[PDB]
């Protein structure tokens, strides 16, 4: 008995020191939310994120691998720095914490047996570890200039066995350079020794290239003044001369910075060249290995590659990537969003350029030796809390909304472009349903290709399906969609999207095109160029939207919760409040989209859960005032009436309740902040009502529950989640709590769980479970229960 984590979904932050690679292994480890996610692009399988190292408390800012060693350091907004050591070939673990720095950390850079920390208090700290004990000891903590300086970026270089330098930039126009020499555990003779001139704004990027020829190398600098400049550095016996004791014309800007570091080492630094030609502030500068080239990212999302000019001596940009015009999610004119990080690496000879997007979407380009380029499959995910989940009626593609108005539409990849099954199927995002100004709290799926949603406005909306998406799914996820030809043609790109389009005003500008993978269900792709992978990041933001069908009013506040009748004819909805008259429910009919007159007044506080019975006869109502009710329906006019009620089930508020199948005889379960899970059974011998069977309690508050669709070996399944993030799987028959397992803390979403949902369409002898939490995460688990 075991599980298999099917998918992991998360989005990147908007900082600059987040990304990091390990060249010998090439494991992209980047911070996200309050954890550090791992990913690997070099694989025939495009799986994605597989593990999120946890342990922090606030948002992570700086992540750095120690170059060719066995450690990794992270820094978070919690005013803390954490150490990690390889515990497995592809897994790490926290080993040490740092208890200094009441203020946060902004800059981070490290070389073996040294840690550089820039505390926004205004201080710079240098650490050196011990010979035999892995606790990185403290060597020095100093300040460049109190009161008027704040660091932004740091860097390091090893001059010799025991001699090192250090560069500092930030809220000024000069680049400071200090030096120090090694000792037993501490550092001595450490002070600022050079103040290079240059830019007219804040220093933002530093880069020390390796030493090809010993003692002489180059430093690059970029600033908010849109210009990039260079500085050449030489060791003694190669320092440029004739500055002293020679009749020559010294210019104002060609000053040479010489320093006698020690009794035997003197370094000379000069200015070399000025590089410009950009549209916004520089954000990332990265070196190379086999060329004198640099990668430049701006705030306009533009990407430039700067190369030396053997003809004119002044470096000219080699390649310019990112000509697509896109600002934010809604594009009107110009482009914006920028690139807030970068990585550059080649496997054999395909160069790879990866950058973080504006909505937590990695964008990665492969290229054939500086000539031609092509975008490969990236990653996408949520950037805020994940509230509500909803499966497909058939047991298919799920919808998982969030607080950042980015509706999701995932799907499994089973047709692997070879006409056969992928040996190991992988999940990906296949459609982005809707975007708008509000938060899109609640969403529900009624039929195979229809859904009803509601955010923080007082209205509910019902949407439709375009054509291209239908064919694209029936190609890649493949599963047959019957009578899909009745749907009319839709569009792809709206200038501003309250929803997509379902009319004759526009059309689709992509032709029917099977570019690749034509060996499974050929000519199923509705007009589009058939990819070799799920839709691209350039396509997700402006192509895969679903048009809206109907609007419907009725509430007096923002939408809280709704549910769909099993007959797919009736729907119930309700908004939150604490007054008696604003805690009612309103119902609508799908064939006419109209309100039914009578009201359902029973509660005085916010409605928490709305759930019809297994048959369209009863409706469950649960709230926070610890009162629950069951209402009966008249099949003639679909109206309702109150039948069953109870007023003292718990002491703390009730969070979630779920039903039971028709086989076992209409049982239900309630979960409340009393950490109490109570099971309610039916009995009618001495009185026709619902009775109490048993209950269980945990150490922390329960948050959501889910019960499997059917029964397995005269017992059913149960899932319970906490606000600590753990998940418990249970087997249960009448009166018997047969605990299955507690899910691993090494896989759980660290924050409060919000919604757990069991799927029904079993395939490969296993079932699926969808987990949505407020940890900026949405996960899929598999159950191959025997």
């Amino acid at each position: 008995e075991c599980i298999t984590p099917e998918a992991i979904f998360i989005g990147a932050n908007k900082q600059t020191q987040v990304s990091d690679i390990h060249k010998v292994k090439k494991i992209v480890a980047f911070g996200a939310g309050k954890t550090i996610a791992l990913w690997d692009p070099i694989e025939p399988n495009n799986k994605g994120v597989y593990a999120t190292l946890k342990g922090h408390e606030a948002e992570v800012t700086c992540v750095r691998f120690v170059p060719d060693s066995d450690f990794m350091v992270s820094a978070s907004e919690d005013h803390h720095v954490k150490i990690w050591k390889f515990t497995d070939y592809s897994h790490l673990q926290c080993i040490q914490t740092i208890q200094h720095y009441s203020k946060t950390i902004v800059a981070l850079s490290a070389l073996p047996s040294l840690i550089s920390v820039g505390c926004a208090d205004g201080t710079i700290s240098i650490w050196r570890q011990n010979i035999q004990n892995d606790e990185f000891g403290l060597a020095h903590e100093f300040t460049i200039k109190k009161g008027f300086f704040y660091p932004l970026c740091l860097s390091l270089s090893k001059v010799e066995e025991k001699k090192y330098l250090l560069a500092i930039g930030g809220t000024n126009v000069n680049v400071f350079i200090a030096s120090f020499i090694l000792s037993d555990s501490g550092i001595e003779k450490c002070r600022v020794v050079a103040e290079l001139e240059g830019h007219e704004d804040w220093v933002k990027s530093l880069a020390f290239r390796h030493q090809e020829t010993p003692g002489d190398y180059l430093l690059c600098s970029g600033s908010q003044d849109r210009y990039i400049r260079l500085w050449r550095i030489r060791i003694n016996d190669l320092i440029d001369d004739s500055e002293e004791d020679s009749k020559k014309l010294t210019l104002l800007s060609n000053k040479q910075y010489k320093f006698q570091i020690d009794d035997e080492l003197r370094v000379g630094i000069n200015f070399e060249a000025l590089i410009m030609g950009h549209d916004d502030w520089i954000s990332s500068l990265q070196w190379h290995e086999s060329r004198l080239q640099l990668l430049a990212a701006t705030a306009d999302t533009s990407l430039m590659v700067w190369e030396p000019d053997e003809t004119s001596g002044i470096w000219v940009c080699s390649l310019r990537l990112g000509e697509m015009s896109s600002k934010g999610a809604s594009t009107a004119t110009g482009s914006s969003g920028g690139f807030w990080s970068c990585l550059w690496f080649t496997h054999e000879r395909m160069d790879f350029f990866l950058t973080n997007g504006k909505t937590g979407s990695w964008r990665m380009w492969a290229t054939k030796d500086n000539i031609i380029c092509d975008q490969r499959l990236g990653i996408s995910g949520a950037t805020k809390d994940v509230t509500d989940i909803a499966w497909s009626p058939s047991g298919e593609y799920l919808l998982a909304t969030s607080l950042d108005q980015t509706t999701r539409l995932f799907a499994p990849w089973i047709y692997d472009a070879s006409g056969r099954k992928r040996e190991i199927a992988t999940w990906h995002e296949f459609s982005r349903p809707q975007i708008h100004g509000y938060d899109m709290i609640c969403v529900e799926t009624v039929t195979d290709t229809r859904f009803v949603s509601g955010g923080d406005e007082k209205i509910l909306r019902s949407f439709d399906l375009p054509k291209g998406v239908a064919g694209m799914l029936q190609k890649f996820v493949g599963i047959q969609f019957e009578e899909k030809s009745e749907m009319p043609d839709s569009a792809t790109v709206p200038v501003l999207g309250l929803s997509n389009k379902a009319g004759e005003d526009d059309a689709n500008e992509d032709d029917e095109e099977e570019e690749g993978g034509n060996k499974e269900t050929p000519d199923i792709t509705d007009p589009l160029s058939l990819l070799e992978c799920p839709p691209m990041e350039d396509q997700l933001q402006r192509h895969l939207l679903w048009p809206e069908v109907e609007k419907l009013y009725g509430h007096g506040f923002e939408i809280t919760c709704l549910d769909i009748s099993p007959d797919q004819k009736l729907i119930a909805s309700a908004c939150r409040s604490n007054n008696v008259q604003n805690a009612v429910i309103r119902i609508f009919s799908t064939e006419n989209w109209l309100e039914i007159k009578p009201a359902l007044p029973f509660h005085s506080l916010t409605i928490t859960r709305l759930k019809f019975s297994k048959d369209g006869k009863f409706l469950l109502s649960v709230c926070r005032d610890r009162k629950w009710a069951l209402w009966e329906r008249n099949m003639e006019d679909n109206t309702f009436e109150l039948r069953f009620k109870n007023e003292k089930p718990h002491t703390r508020i009730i969070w979630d309740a779920d039903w039971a199948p028709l086989e076992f005889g209409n049982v239900f379960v309630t979960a409340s902040r009393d950490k109490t899970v109570k099971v309610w059974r039916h009995q009618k011998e001495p009185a026709d009502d619902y009775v109490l069977e048993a209950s269980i309690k945990h150490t922390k508050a329960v948050t959501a529950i889910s019960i499997h669709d059917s029964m397995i070996r005269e017992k059913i399944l149960i899932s319970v989640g906490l606000e600590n993030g753990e998940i418990y799987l249970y087997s249960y028959t009448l009166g018997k709590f047969e605990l299955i397992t507690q899910l691993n803390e090494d896989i759980t979403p660290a924050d409060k769980i919000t919604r757990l949902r069991w799927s029904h369409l079993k395939r490969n002898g296993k079932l699926f479970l969808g987990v949505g939490s407020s940890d900026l995460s949405t996960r899929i688990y598999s159950l191959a229960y025997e």
């Binding site: 600059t16 203020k103 926004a120 704040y150 502030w281 999610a329 809604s330 100004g437």
Partner: protein, 464 residues
């Protein structure tokens, strides 16, 4: 130079004073409940700023960055920008929203990418493209001491609290939730904190005559309670979607003609005290949707012709300003003198210093000073001894040319020091103070740190 005004927008919401009156105030157009429904109140959503806000889905970062870049690309280079917020009642929204909003608005210019607003403002102090304050719009019911502390921490410098009338029936018949008298204590508590306060007025309202309109303004300017540092006059225009159009539909409303309104404006402009800046008698309106009223694009263009026919022309700040550099230096000015006025306003004595030409009445530089009282101060900075506050420093005296032997190549760069030492003289002698403080935007916390003022909390203070 390069003074910039970049307006931003907040997400739509509902001011809670509707709750105890039922609807919005009668004259407020549009709103979430109206047909537009994607727009903050008092704005129809058809303004250019509304368009730029909608396409960004009401996000401060994108609006600020886009407007700044557009202004820079047009041909002007910006290094001094003042933010202004609009729409409804910004303070009603929850806690985290305001914090995140302010942090984003400061990190847009600072280039910072952090949190913990203290650090954001600390980095914004040491940044290029300095910010010279914020202008927050709020209501009397939300100006309590906790909220005032919040605004002081954020970096705001001046408020604008509307009153719209001084009669007592208008407050209830316009569905506005505050008695008139409480605004006076609001002004009293606000002023002692150093916040410049500006108000609003609307001449024509239902059940108001031309007379009552005249003496309400007269009482506003004369009474020692309604003396504030600014004004805005909004002639009443009837939009179809407002609660004002219903009155005209039912015949329960009628407006003034053109002659009556121009005479009223002419009389009003002939009474303004010389320390209040009349902002806009010729305000900006949604033009085609108005159903009742008169044209307002050139009201003052005719009011000036009226004062030239009756005498006693206007004396506000705006008409007498000469500007930072060469706005009216086509002619060499005349005798320059120092004029000092004193007045009692909101339970305290205040002083207004200016450098003016008395023969032709132009203005070059001005300063405001307040002697702190004992019945309104609550800050731990001002509750330890007597103190005085420089509410505003204003130096258009950055003028290069002048009258009476201007500095040759020093060109009035020490002109502001004259006023600063003048203020310190009477702070030491007349007030008998033991500490003097100045309030300013975070971006200009160094033009005052050279004269000796040192930082405590959100204030720039030095002892005696």
């Amino acid at each position: 130079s390069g003074i910039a005004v970049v307006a931003v927008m907040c997400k739509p919401h509902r001011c809670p004073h509707i709750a105890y009156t039922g609807n919005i105030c009668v004259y407020c157009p549009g709103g979430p409940d109206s047909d537009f429904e994607y727009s903050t109140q008092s704005y129809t959503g058809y303004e250019p700023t509304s368009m730029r806000a909608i396409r960004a889905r009401y996000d401060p970062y994108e609006q600020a960055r886009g407007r700044v870049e557009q202004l820079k690309q047009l041909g002007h280079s910006i290094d001094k920008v003042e933010y202004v917020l609009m729409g409804g009642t910004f303070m009603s929204l929850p806690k985290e929203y305001r914090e995140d909003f302010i942090v984003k608005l400061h990190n847009a210019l600072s280039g910072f990418n952090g949190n913990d607003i203290d650090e954001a403002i600390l980095y914004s102090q040491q940044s290029l493209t300095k910010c010279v304050g914020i202008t927050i719009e709020t209501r009397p019911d939300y100006c309590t001491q906790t909220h005032l502390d919040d605004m002081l921490k954020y970096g705001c410098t001046r408020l604008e609290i509307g009153v719209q009338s001084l009669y007592e029936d208008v407050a209830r018949d316009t569905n506005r939730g505050h008695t008139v008298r409480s605004v006076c204590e609001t002004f009293a508590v606000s002023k002692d904190a150093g916040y410049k306060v500006v108000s609003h007025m609307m001449p024509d309202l239902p059940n108001v005559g031309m007379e009552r309109d005249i003496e309400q303004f007269k009482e506003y300017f004369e009474n020692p309670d309604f003396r504030t540092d600014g004004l805005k006059i909004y002639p009443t225009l009837v939009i179809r979607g407002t609660g004002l159009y219903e009155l005209w539909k039912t015949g329960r409303y009628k407006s003034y003609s053109a002659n009556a309104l121009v005479d009223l404006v002419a009389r009003i402009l002939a009474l303004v005290p010389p320390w209040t800046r009349i902002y806009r008698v010729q305000r900006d309106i949604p033009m085609p949707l108005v159903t009742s009223g008169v044209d307002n694009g050139n009201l003052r263009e005719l009011a000036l012709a009226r004062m030239k026919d009756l005498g006693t022309t206007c004396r506000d700040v705006r008409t007498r300003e000469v500007g930072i550099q060469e706005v009216h230096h086509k002619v060499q000015p005349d005798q320059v003198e120092l004029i000092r006025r004193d007045y009692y306003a909101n339970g305290g004595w205040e002083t207004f210093l200016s450098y003016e030409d008395p023969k032709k009445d132009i203005l070059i530089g001005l300063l405001r000073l307040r002697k702190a009282s004992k019945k309104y101060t609550y800050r731990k900075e001002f509750t330890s001894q007597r103190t005085s506050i420089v509410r505003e420093l204003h130096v258009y005296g950055s003028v290069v040319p002048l009258h009476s032997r201007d500095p040759r190549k020093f060109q009035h760069q020490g002109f502001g020091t004259l006023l600063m030492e003048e203020a310190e003289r009477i702070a030491k002698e007349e007030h008998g103070s033991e500490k003097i403080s100045v309030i300013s935007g975070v971006g200009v916390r160094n033009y005052y740190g050279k004269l000796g003022y040192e930082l405590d909390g959100p204030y720039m203070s030095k002892r005696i």
